[PDB]
Antibody, heavy 214, light 219 residues
Framework: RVQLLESGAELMKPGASVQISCKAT????????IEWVKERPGHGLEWIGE????????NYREKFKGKATFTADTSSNTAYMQLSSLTSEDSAVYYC?????????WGQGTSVTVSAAKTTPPSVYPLAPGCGDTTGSSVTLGCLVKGYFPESVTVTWNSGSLSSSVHTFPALLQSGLYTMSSSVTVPSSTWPSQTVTCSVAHPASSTTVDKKLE | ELVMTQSPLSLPVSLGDQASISCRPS???????????LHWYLQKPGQSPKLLIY???NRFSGVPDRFSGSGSGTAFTLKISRVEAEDLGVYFC?????????FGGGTKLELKRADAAPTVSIFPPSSEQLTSGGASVVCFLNNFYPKDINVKWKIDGSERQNGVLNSWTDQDSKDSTYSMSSTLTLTKDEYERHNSYTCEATHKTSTSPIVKSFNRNEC
């Protein structure tokens, strides 16, 4: 019945700080601890800190005292998290929460990504076996994508002809830029009898590319 | 603080079985109020995880009969008796008698499979990457099982480089195998400063580690 909705994921420059909010529908505010948690890929969950609305009371993880602030506007039923002096290690997904003798109900999720970056398009490098190595069954192929921002990358790697095992590997977040591949399973006969081609589509810039391999 | 060692990190279970996945905290979780505070949660890929059994034993609202929750001391278990599709994900056990609120590592539940030797394919560098003064090499270790798989790049044997980006894959729908990429990244020149590199993958299927090579030279 109760709901906790959060503001939408942001992209912030370093230094600058964000204001995540957590609106609660379906009860009285002033009684439950408004919890917030840190979900960083790899680390897991770092309870950040408590605060009950109404009393104005608070509670922080030693670690976070000085980086986070918690406020609540009882007559608007929003909760607050202000992470000042942002940085590369705060880039993660944050949840607010109603929890007592349990972590009752969890908000959806605000993503906060810290990066210097300015929009830029995927420099597309086509992975094609070189001089006489790989032989036989499936000629496997690929299309690498080296650097760009932000996540808006989508690959139509619709086969070259006779093929299916298509893998789209995840995106690493290195040096504030993005870099991921695509990879395909095309059997000898069908290649290069016909040609396979990738299309890297980065709508964050309405820029797109088609590249035949070999 | 106080640790929470989720006794087992990957439950490869075929559907329709029991599911023990133990969680041991560091101290007593018994507050001076009387009740202890271990608690369970299930996190479904893409969504803010959720409350399973709360207060150790106690079952939650809109929450299956198929979940057992019981313990005492430095030992707490969660037991799903008829695992069934919608229960696949990770399970953070938790603590709340001591500030701060530690969360366990998170054991996962993946589809069972029998081993499946990984297929490696090295691809050299493309002239246009070559052209921007950059140069990557990528050796794909596709559609295989089980997960655990390390991959060392003894470029020309001696040096164990480490300018590597590893991209995994969430388990396959109709396969239940995984697939991976490894991009050793060179300074164009660095690349044109050697003759043949090798990608070494060690995955308990083989005795003799699956190695593939690439000759910068005779080509």
């Amino acid at each position: 019945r109760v709901q906790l909705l959060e503001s939408g994921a942001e992209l912030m420059k370093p230094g600058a700080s964000v204001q995540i909010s957590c609106k609660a529908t379906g009860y009285t505010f002033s009684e439950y601890w408004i919890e917030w948690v840190k979900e960083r890929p790899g680390h897991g969950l770092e309870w950040i800190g408590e605060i009950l609305p109404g009393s104005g009371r608070t509670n922080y993880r030693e670690k976070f005292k000085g980086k986070a602030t918690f406020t609540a506007d009882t007559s608007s039923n929003t909760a607050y998290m202000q992470l000042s002096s942002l940085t590369s290690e705060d880039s993660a997904v944050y949840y607010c929460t109603r929890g007592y003798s349990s972590m009752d109900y969890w908000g959806q999720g605000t993503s906060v990504t810290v990066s210097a970056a300015k929009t830029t398009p995927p420099s597309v490098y086509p992975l094609a076996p070189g001089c006489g190595d790989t032989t036989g069954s499936s000629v496997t192929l690929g299309c690498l994508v080296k650097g760009y921002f932000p996540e808006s990358v989508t690959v139509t790697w619709n086969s070259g002809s006779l093929s299916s095992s298509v893998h789209t590997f995840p995106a690493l977040l290195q040096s504030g830029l993005y870099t991921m591949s695509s990879s395909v399973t095309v059997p000898s006969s069908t290649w290069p009898s016909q040609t396979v081609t990738c299309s890297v589509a980065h709508p964050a810039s309405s820029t797109t590319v088609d590249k035949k391999l070999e | 603080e106080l640790v929470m060692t989720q006794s087992p990190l990957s439950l490869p279970v075929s559907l329709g079985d029991q599911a023990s996945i133990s969680c041991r905290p560091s101290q007593s979780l018994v507050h001076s109020n009387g009740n202890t505070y271990l608690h369970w949660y299930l996190q479904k890929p893409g969504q803010s995880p959720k409350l399973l059994i709360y207060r150790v034993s106690n079952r939650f609202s809109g929450v299956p009969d198929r979940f057992s929750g019981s313990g005492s001391g430095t030992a707490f278990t969660l037991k799903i008796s008829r695992v069934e599709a919608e229960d696949l994900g990770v399970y953070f056990c938790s603590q709340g008698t001591h500030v701060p609120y530690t969360f366990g590592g998170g054991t996962k539940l993946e589809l069972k499979r029998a081993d499946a030797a990984p297929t490696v394919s090295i691809f050299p560098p493309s002239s246009e990457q070559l052209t921007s003064g950059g140069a990557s090499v990528v050796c794909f270790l596709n559609n295989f099982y089980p997960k655990d798989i390390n991959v060392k790049w003894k470029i020309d044997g001696s040096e164990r480089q480490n300018g590597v980006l590893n991209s995994w894959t969430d388990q396959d729908s109709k396969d239940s195998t995984y697939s991976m990429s490894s991009t050793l990244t060179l300074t164009k020149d660095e690349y044109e400063r050697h003759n043949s590199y090798t990608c070494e993958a060690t995955h308990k299927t083989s005795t003799s580690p699956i190695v593939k090579s690439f000759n910068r030279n005779e080509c």
